[PDB]
């Protein structure tokens, strides 16, 4: 937890992949009856 | 989320994400097809717009 | 003289950010070409297509593919399922009765077996054997294939073409980028022989003392030539006819792919007109428009002049389908499928 | 957090529309130029191979055609975020810095 | 003085520059602009005083 200072920089593409967990591909949220992802 | 009476409620961002993904996917489609550059342009103005 | 309207207008466009004015002003350029330009676009398209059917007729193993994978689905004691719905399915210029299937593939195999002996008579393309190859094409051209399986059969020529080009890239890379041999002499000698490596030591024979420096990589270069000549065994077709078939086929594509854009760019106003009957506050304008262009491109791909009707009706149906279910697939945060 | 891969590149807005622009200010190309590139309204010279033409030079869709057939190969001029990315990607910071 | 500043000489160009004030950019045409102006304050539909 314990940290010292803050930094800003630009989000490189490889950074955004590095953080991300999986490529979204759809607008779909859920099913109409089975209210589930 | 839902409410008591079956109603749902959402944040406005999801609309925006949906528009984005619809537009990107349609663009990919139009790129598989060698379709005219004019509709490419229009789809991209729509993209940068959203 | 509409591009020069865009010119001075854009010079004096009042910082207009809206793409609606942009696109709508851009389609204003192209006009509505009709009544035979439709029929002429169709003529050019079907011409180029029938000439890619020349391009299949010129390739020998095109028939080998057909009879082979057809024998795969007939092999299984009897089938009438999918592959026969990609295969034979001829246009009549149905539930497949195997009787007529056994019929049509008789004379095709007669032209097959009878045409090969003369191809060896005194030369690959003797005049008589050449006219018999032309007979093979004429028998080929009354067949109109399903676009799926056909597109595979043409991909069997596109891919191979790109493998010829592939080894051009390889040998060009390792030879010219490293040893720095001129391509000028290479066109002349490589065009001259194409079959044996006499051009190698005939080029080194033009002394050029760097050419003597090919020992360190000698085992590798013509071993790169190996994969070039190997394609000649796998193809069994001479290099001139390779080039001719490739280029002529590509033109067979270019006709249609150039032809349709006039149609689409013409009927954009139909697309938008029908679109904005349904741009009540359902989703949004431009998405109805874009989907309308999709249905339009379908109708341009499907339309027949021989039905002799107006085009407007056809793509009216198609457009209307496309929009009418894109609004329903999309346009909600919760997807309600079509039935509900 | 997830991610998305894009068909074509697109530009961030705060680095464009904000006062002093940080994108056109860097290129020394004012706003309406870059707009008319990015609204797909005109082209712009990524790299004029011939020095006959210029970096950061605009070419209308009709005038470009002149330059199109006159020379062909020896210019690089395009349109949209692709071209501008090629431009920022091209510009070396150093020599411009010692020159300023 | 306002005339000496006014570049417009005929009725038509006046209609064109009104049309251009309100529909900027757009390639102007006669009846689009005539109909525009007349719609603004001379059509019963889009203008009523009470």
Render B10-46 in DSSP notation, one character per residue. Answer: --THHHHHHHHHHHHHHHHHHHHTT--HHHHHHHHHH
Is the Cα dihedral D17, D23, D25, D29 positive or negative?
negative
Strand partners, A23: D3
Q: Which of C181, C166, C158 is nearest to C224 (CA)?
A: C166
Q: Which of D82, C96, C138, C305 is nearest to B44 (CA)?
A: D82
User: Do A24 and D5 lie within an 8 Å CB cutoff?
Assistant: no
User: Do C333 and B29 lie within an 8 Å CB cutoff?
Assistant: no
DSSP H stretches of helix in chain D = 14-17, 24-27, 31-38, 63-71, 81-90, 93-99
User: Do C330 and B33 lie within an 8 Å CB cutoff?
Assistant: no
Please list every residue in chain D whose beta carbon sits closer than 8 Å to the beta carbon of residue A21: 1-2
D59, two tokens: 């070419």
What distance in Å separates the CA atoms of residue C126 and residue C199, rounded to the nearest whole number? 29
Of C5, C16, C28, the CB nearest to E24: C16
Q: Do chains D and A touch (3 or more CB pairs under 8 A)?
A: yes
What would the 3-class secondary structure string for C281-296 be? CCCCHHHHHHHHHHHH
The number of residues making up chain B comes to 50
CB neighbour list of residue E28: distance below 8 Å, 6 or more residues apart: E16, E19, E20
Contact, C28 vs C2, CB < 8 A?
yes
Torsion of the alpha carbons at C100, C106, C112 and C118, rounded to the nearest 10: -140
CB neighbour list of residue C320: distance below 8 Å, 6 or more residues apart: C274, C295
* C164 secondary structure, DSSP code: H
Q: Do chains B and D touch (3 or more CB pairs under 8 A)?
A: yes
> Within 13 Å, how many C-alpha atoms sit on residue C211's CB side?
12
C14, two tokens: 């009042």
Q: Do chains E and A touch (3 or more CB pairs under 8 A)?
A: no
Please list every residue in chain C whose beta carbon sits closer than 8 Å to the beta carbon of residue A32: 334-336, 340
Of B22, B36, B45, the CB nearest to C265: B36
Contact, D38 vs D80, CB < 8 A?
yes
Q: Tokens 């593409």, residue?
A: A13
Q: By what method was this entry solved? A: cryo-EM
Check residue C194 and give left, alpha or beta (phi > 0: left; psi -120 to 50: alpha).
left
Give the 3-state secondary structure of residue C107: helix
Q: Which of D48, D34, D42 is nearest to D85 (CA)?
A: D34
Radius of gyration of chain D, Cα coordinates, nearest whole angstrom:
15
Q: Which of C56, C61, C116, C52 is nearest to C234 (CA)?
A: C61
What angle do helix axes C3-12 and C19-27 make, rounded to 10 degrees? 160
Shortest CA gap A15–chain B (Å): 21
Alpha carbon C170 to chain centroid, angstroms: 25
What distance in Å separates the CA atoms of residue C62 and residue C249, rounded to the nearest whole number? 14
CB neighbour list of residue C172: distance below 8 Å, 6 or more residues apart: C183
What distance in Å separates the CA atoms of residue C10 and residue C194, rounded to the nearest whole number? 55
Sheet containing D58-59: which strands, arranged edge to edge?
D58-59, D43-47, D76-78
Beta strands in C223-340 (DSSP E): none
Contact, B46 vs B25, CB < 8 A?
no
Those chains having 3 or more beta-carbon pairs within 8 angstroms of chain E are: C
Q: CB atoms < 10 A from the CB of C271, how many?
A: 27
What distance in Å separates the CA atoms of residue C212 and residue C89, rounded to the nearest whole number? 61
What is the per-residue DSSP string for C127-149? HHHHHHHHHHHHHHHT----HHH
Is the Cα dihedral C142, C146, C149, C152 positive or negative?
positive
Q: What percent helix, strand, coil does chain E show, rounded to 5?
A: 60, 0, 40
Contact, C299 vs C270, CB < 8 A?
no
Contact, C204 vs C212, CB < 8 A?
yes
Contact, C265 vs C310, CB < 8 A?
no
Of D41, D60, D62, the CB nearest to C22: D41
User: Do D8 and B20 lie within an 8 Å CB cutoff?
Assistant: no
Contact, C115 vs C140, CB < 8 A?
no
User: Do B21 and A29 lie within an 8 Å CB cutoff?
Assistant: no
Check residue C126 and give left, alpha or beta (phi > 0: left; psi -120 to 50: alpha).
beta
Query: Containing H/E element for C98?
Result: helix C98-119
CB neighbour list of residue C58: distance below 8 Å, 6 or more residues apart: C137, C241, C245, C248
Strand partners, D45: D77
Contact, A11 vs D3, CB < 8 A?
no
What distance in Å separates the CA atoms of residue C311 and residue C289, rounded to the nearest whole number? 19
What angle do helix axes C285-302 and C19-27 make, rounded to 10 degrees? 30
Query: Containing H/E element for D3?
Result: none
What distance in Å separates the CA atoms of residue C119 and residue C125, rounded to the nearest whole number? 6
Q: Which of C186, C171, C162, C284 is nearest to C220 (CA)?
A: C171
Q: Which residue of C has its CA nearest to B21?
A: C330
User: Do C290 and B42 lie within an 8 Å CB cutoff?
Assistant: yes
Those chains having 3 or more beta-carbon pairs within 8 angstroms of chain B are: A, C, D
C77, two tokens: 């004691």
C-alpha distances out from residue C331 to B40, C279, C290, Å: 21, 12, 14
Shortest CA gap E50–chain C (Å): 30
Q: Does residue C334 belong to the interface with chain A, where contact is any CB pair within 8 Å?
A: yes
């Amino acid at each position: 937890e314990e940290f010292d200072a803050i930094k800003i920089a630009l989000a490189s593409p490889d950074m955004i992949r590095s953080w991300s967990f999986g490529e979204v591909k759809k607008p779909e949220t859920i099913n109409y009856r089975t209210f589930k992802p | 989320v839902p409410l008591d009476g079956g109603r749902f409620a959402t944040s406005d961002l999801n609309d925006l994400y949906r528009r984005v993904i619809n537009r990107n996917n349609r663009l990919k489609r139009l790129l598989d097809l060698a379709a005219p550059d004019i509709i490419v342009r229009n789809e991209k103005r729509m993209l940068q717009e959203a | 003289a509409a591009a020069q309207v865009l010119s001075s207008v854009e010079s004096e466009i009042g910082r207009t950010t809206d793409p609606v004015r942009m696109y709508m002003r851009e389609m204003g350029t192209v006009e509505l070409l009709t009544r035979e330009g439709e029929i002429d676009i169709a003529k050019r398209i079907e011409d180029g297509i029938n000439q890619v059917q020349c391009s299949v007729a010129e390739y020998p193993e095109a028939i080998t593919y057909l009879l082979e994978q057809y024998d795969r689905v007939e092999a299984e004691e009897a089938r009438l399922s999918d592959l026969i719905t990609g295969f034979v399915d001829p246009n009549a210029e149905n539930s497949i009765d195997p009787e007529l299937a056994r019929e049509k593939f008789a004379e095709l195999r007669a032209q097959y077996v009878v045409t090969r002996d003369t191809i060896k008579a005194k030369g690959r393309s003797h005049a008589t054997a050449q006219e018999e190859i032309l007979k093979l094409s004429e028998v080929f051209k009354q067949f109109r294939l399903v676009p799926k399986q056909f597109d595979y059969l043409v991909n069997s020529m596109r891919v191979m073409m790109d493998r010829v080009r592939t080894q051009e890239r390889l040998i060009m890379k390792l030879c010219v980028e490293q040893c720095k041999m001129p391509k000028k002499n290479f066109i002349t000698l490589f065009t001259g022989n194409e079959t044996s490596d006499t051009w190698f030591n005939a080029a080194i024979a033009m002394n050029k003392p760097w050419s003597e420096k090919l020992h360190d990589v000698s085992e590798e270069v013509h071993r790169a030539l190996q994969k070039l000549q190997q394609i000649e065994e796998e193809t069994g077709l001479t290099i001139e006819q390779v080039k001719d078939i490739n280029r002529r086929m590509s033109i067979g594509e270019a006709k249609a792919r150039r032809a349709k854009k006039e149609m689409v760019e013409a009927n954009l106003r139909l697309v938008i007109s029908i679109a904005k009957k349904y741009t009540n506050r359902g989703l949004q304008f431009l998405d109805l428009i874009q989907e309308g262009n999709i249905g339009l491109m379908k109708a341009v791909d499907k339309f027949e002049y021989r039905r002799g009707y107006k085009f407007s009706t056809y793509a009216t149906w198609w457009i209307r389908q496309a929009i009418t279910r894109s609004i329903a697939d999309q346009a909600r945060t919760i997807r309600i499928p079509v039935h509900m | 957090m997830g991610h998305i891969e894009l068909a074509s590149p697109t530009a961030h807005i705060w680095f464009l529309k904000s006062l002093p622009s940080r994108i056109g200010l860097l290129l020394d190309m004012p706003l309406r130029d870059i707009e008319r590139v990015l609204y797909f309204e005109s082209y712009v010279v990524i790299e004029g191979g011939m020095t006959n033409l210029e970096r950061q030079q605009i070419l209308t869709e009709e005038q470009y055609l002149d330059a199109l057939e006159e020379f062909g190969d020896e210019f690089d001029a395009k349109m949209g975020a692709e071209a501008i990315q090629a431009l920022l990607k091209s510009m070396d910071l150093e020599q411009e810095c010692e020159q300023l | 003085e306002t005339l000496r500043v006014d570049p417009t000489n005929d009725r038509l160009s006046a209609l064109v520059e009104i049309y251009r004030m309100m529909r900027p950019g757009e390639p102007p045409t006669r009846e689009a602009a005539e109909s525009l102006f007349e719609n603004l304050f001379f059509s019963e539909d889009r203008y009523d005083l009470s």
